[PDB]
Amino acid sequence: QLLDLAQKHFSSLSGTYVEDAVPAFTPCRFTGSEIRHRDDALPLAHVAIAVEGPGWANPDNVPLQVANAIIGHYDSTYGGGTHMSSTLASVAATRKLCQSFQTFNICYAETGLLGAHFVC
Amino acid sequence: GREFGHLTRMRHVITYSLSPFEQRAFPHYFTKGIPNVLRRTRACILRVAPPFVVFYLVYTWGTQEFEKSKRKNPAAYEN
């Protein structure tokens, strides 16, 4: 039924590019750099640190997701606190280092941002 | 007391930096460095050199005057 409805309605839409102006995908370079917007008025500091990561189709995404899960995520509202398995989360809860910290694995077609974001 | 956290209050100052491994250690070292050195020397020289020029003049004058002092005076043995 979905296929028939698609044939009924979306069929007119075409993949031809006017005057053969076809957009071409471009690999994006990853540049190790630091951008600091120092605004001492703000209550808490947000820092995001990342390294270049695999693309969507790269097989290494799964082990990296396992590694990030090992690192874990913590927020001040988490009940686990000190006893939480994540060493970073445990130390953060014990010393009240950060309000929240989470690990992200953003993946794009050919590059990705692998790292963590912590508010402290 | 003096620690990075509470040194001073600054706002809305954004700084962009590059990784050392992504940038060249010596960028335009001679093409830009030599003109900059010349500019710095031009700015400083008028203030710096003249005292040492005066010292050199004084030193030469003193050395020559001492050498003259040691030298014989003919008039002393005229008689």
Is A93 within 8 Å of A81 (Cβ atoms)?
Answer: yes
Check B14 against A34: CB less than 8 A apart.
no
Which residues make beta-bridge pairs with A102? Answer: A117
B23 touching A, CB under 8 A? no
Distance, CA of B27 to CA of B32 (rounded, Å)? 9
Q: Which structure tokens are listed for A92?
A: 């953060």
Q: Which two tokens stand for residue B63?
A: 């050395």
DSSP character string of chain A:
-HHHHHHHHGGG---PPGGG------------EEEEEE-TTSSS-EEEEEEEE--SS-TTHHHHHHHHHHH--EETT-S-GGGSS-HHHHHHHHHT--SEEEEEEEE-SS-EEEEEEEE-
Which chain A residues touch B21 with a CB distance below 8 Å? 32
DSSP secondary structure of chain B: ---GGGS----SEEEEEE-GGGS-SSTTTTTTHHHHHHHHHHHHHHHHHHHHHHHHHHHHHHHHHHHHHHS--GGGG--
What strand order describes the sheet that includes A74-75? A46-53, A112-119, A100-107, A74-75
Q: Give the one of A31, A38, A41 whose C-beta lies nearest to B22's C-beta.
A: A31
Nearest CA-CA distance, residue B43 and chain A, Å:
35
Pair B13, A40: CB distance under 8 Å: no
CB of A117 within 8 A of CB of A50?
Answer: no
- Best of B6, B7, B11 to disrupt the A interface (most A CBs within 10 Å) is B11
Q: Rounded CA gap, A51 and B29, in Å?
A: 31
By C-alpha distance, the chain A residue nearest B16 is: A35
Structure-block tokens of residue A12: 């007119």
Q: Does B7 touch chain A (CB under 8 A)?
A: no
Using a 10 angstrom Cβ sphere, with 0-12 exposed, 13-18 middle and 19 or more buried, the burial of residue A50 is middle
Identify residue A77 by its one-letter amino acid code: T
